[PDB]
């Protein structure tokens, strides 16, 4: 729970850092990443899979390790 919490704190830190809001992600990604889904990752309310995390890190353009708590 705490881990999920802190993981989502970084998922948010990277997203906002490149100036994108949650709606921004859904739009730029042509709908592959739904704001709803990404938000729930950022609040630790929904658990991302390691696979899925790997793709996000790619979409954002950062080393996937960096998103780990």
Author numbering: 3 to 71
Show passages lifted from the paper:
Here, we report that c-di-GMP can assemble into a tetramer that mediates the effective dimerization of a transcription factor, BldD, which controls the progression of multicellular differentiation in sporulating actinomycete bacteria. BldD is an 18 kDa DNA-binding protein consisting of two distinct domains connected by a flexible linker. BldD sits at the top of the regulatory cascade controlling development, serving to repress expression of sporulation genes during vegetative growth (den Hengst et al., 2010). Specifically, structural and biochemical analyses show that the second messenger c-di-GMP activates BldD DNA binding by driving a unique form of dimerization that is mediated by a tetrameric form of c-di-GMP.
The N-terminal domain is the DNA-binding domain (DBD) and has a xenobiotic response element (XRE) helix-turn-helix (HTH) DNA-binding motif (Kim et al., 2006). Our data and those of others (Lee et al., 2007a) show that the BldD DBD alone can dimerize at higher concentrations (≥10 μM). Consistent with these findings, the crystal structure of the S. coelicolor BldD DBD revealed a dimer with a small contact interface (Kim et al., 2006). We obtained additional views of the BldD DBD by solving the S. venezuelae BldD DBD structure to 2.80 Å resolution. This structure contained two DBD dimers in the asymmetric unit. Comparison of these dimers with the dimer from the S. coelicolor DBD structure showed that, although hydrophobic residues within the C-terminal regions of the DBDs make contacts between the subunits in each case, all three dimers take distinct conformations. Moreover, there is less than 300 Å2 BSA per subunit in this dimer, which is far less than the 1000 Å2 BSA per subunit typically observed for biologically relevant dimers. These data indicate that the BldD DBD is unlikely to form a stable DNA-binding active dimer at physiologically relevant concentrations. The DBD-DBD interacting surfaces observed in the BldD-DNA complex correspond to the hydrophobic regions near the DBD C terminus that interact in the apo DBD structures. However, the interfaces are yet again different, supporting the notion that DBD dimerization is weak and malleable.
